[PDB]
Write a protein that binds this ligand. Structure first.
Ligand code: CL
Length: 141
């Protein structure tokens, strides 16, 4: 009734990953994004207290952000072409958490149903992030 999906943004390269089985650990509380001049290289997401497996490669610099207590992502925009290139996570505390350089084809993802937040991500990866998708749902009870 409340879940929705935005995606997939990127190419068909790489291999699928999904954090759907990480939801049970809790809401998103932190993000790691490995970045270079051209690409989103890797991703890791913290669900409650539990970091997901890392996906992607190592040819970039690791950027990390903890969300403030009770803060959630409510919109994600970005850029891609043959791989993912840029991500901006917009939060319900007004923060715009940006990773990567402005180049490529844009996407702009918002949740379909009322009062939902980013609950987990999925996508495709190898040595880079080939594609990403955003999964929205209610903030967990
Ligand atoms: Cl590209």
């Amino acid at each position: 009734r409340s879940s929705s999906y935005s995606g997939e943004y990127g190419s068909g390269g790489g291999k699928r990953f999904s954090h759907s089985g990480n939801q049970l650990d809790g809401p998103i509380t932190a993000l790691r994004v490995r970045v270079n001049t051209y690409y989103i290289v890797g991703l890791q997401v913290r669900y409650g207290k539990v970091w997901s497996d890392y996906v992607g490669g190592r040819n970039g610099d690791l950027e990390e952000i903890f969300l403030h207590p009770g803060e959630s992502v409510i919109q994600v925009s970005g850029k891609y072409k043959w791989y993912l290139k840029k991500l901006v996570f917009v939060t319900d505390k007004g923060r715009y958490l940006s990773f990567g350089k402005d180049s490529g084809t844009s996407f702009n993802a918002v949740p379909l149903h009322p009062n939902t937040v980013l609950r987990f991500i999925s996508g495709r990866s190898g040595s880079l992030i080939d594609a990403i998708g955003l999964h929205w749902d209610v903030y967990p009870t």
